[PDB]
């Protein structure tokens, strides 16, 4: 299996699925390094974020658990296609990159927060992460290049 993937069993349905413990991605099909990657993200901050402030909210007060619930809901909408990642990033990301549809540009290893970097470089081109935790908050990461 590709880097960081394991087999798991669905608790509701009993069907086998696959889980990546670096990106927190999960998918039903069996899963299919560069100097740099290009990613977008959607950040949901919380009261324990290193800077609990954003363009959306001068004082961010939501709990870490409430932030995770928001992230999980956004992931549901992106995967069902009801909403686009770029649309939700522009509207709801607590990062200044919201105004760029969440795009962060290209980057190398040794520039970004470690959990963010590890998830970014473990994603395949076009693939989206599950919830990724850093000192800034909780992220959904989309690798675009
Ligand atoms: O929320 C974030 C902060 C700003 C940039 C995007 C993401 C990860 C990072 O390391 C770089 C810290
Ligand atoms: Cl790839």
Domains of the chain, start order: 1-31 (2.20.70.10), 36-145 (3.10.50.40)
Q: What is the DSSP letter of 128?
A: B
Give CA–CA dist 80/75, Å, rounded: 9
Question: Do the Cβ atoms of 132 and 138 come closer than 8 Å?
Answer: yes
CB-hemisphere CA count at 13 Å for 1?
13
**Sheet (strand 16-20) strand order:** 5-9, 16-20, 26-27
Give CA–CA dist 115/99, Å, rounded: 23
In this structure, which residue's CA is closest to atom 1 in ligand 1?
136
Structure tokens at 36: 């740099």
Q: Which of 50, 98, 134, 142 to mutate to test the pocket of ligand 1 (most atoms within 8 A of CB)?
A: 134
**Protein residues whose CB sits closer than 6 Å to any atom of ligand 1:** 41, 43, 95, 104, 112-113, 116, 136
Tokens 């693939």, located at residue = 127
Structure method: X-ray
Question: Do the Cβ atoms of 13 and 26 come closer than 8 Å?
Answer: no
Question: Do the Cβ atoms of 37 and 106 come closer than 8 Å?
Answer: yes
- Neighbouring CB atoms inside 10 A of 87's CB total 13
Please list the residues that pair with 108 across neighbouring strands.
36
- Neighbouring CB atoms inside 10 A of 96's CB total 10
Instruction: Considering only CA atoms, give the Rg of the chain.
Output: 15
Residues in contact with 70: Cβ distance below 8 Å, sequence separation at least 6, in sequence order:
44, 62, 92
Give the long-range contacts of residues 92-96, CB within 8 A, separation 24 or more: 92/42, 92/44, 92/56, 93/41, 93/42, 93/43, 93/44, 94/43, 94/44, 94/45, 94/49, 94/54, 94/55, 94/56, 94/57, 94/60, 94/137, 95/41, 95/42, 95/43, 95/54, 95/136, 96/54, 96/55
Give which of 106, 96, 94 is closest to 46, Cα–Cα. Answer: 94
Instruction: Return the ligand 1 atom nearest residue 111 CA.
Output: 10
Report the SS3 class of residue 24. Answer: coil
Please list the residues that pair with 6 across neighbouring strands.
19
């Amino acid at each position: 299996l590709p880097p960081g993937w394991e087999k798991a069993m669905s608790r509701s349905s009993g069907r086998v699925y696959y889980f990546n413990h670096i990106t927190n991605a999960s998918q039903w099909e069996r899963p299919s390094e560069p100097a740099r990657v290009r990613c977008s993200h959607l950040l949901v901050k919380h009261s324990q974020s290193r800077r609990p402030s954003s363009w959306r909210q001068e004082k961010i007060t939501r709990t870490k658990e409430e932030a995770l619930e928001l992230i999980n809901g956004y992931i549901q909408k992106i995967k069902s296609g009801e909403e686009d990642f770029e649309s939700l990033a522009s509207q709801f990301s607590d990062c200044s990159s919201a105004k760029a549809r969440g795009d962060l540009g290209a980057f190398s290893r040794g520039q970004m927060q470690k959990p963010f970097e590890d998830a970014s470089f473990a994603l395949r081109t076009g693939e989206m992460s599950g919830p990724v935790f850093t000192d800034s908050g909780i992220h959904i990461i989309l690798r675009t290049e």
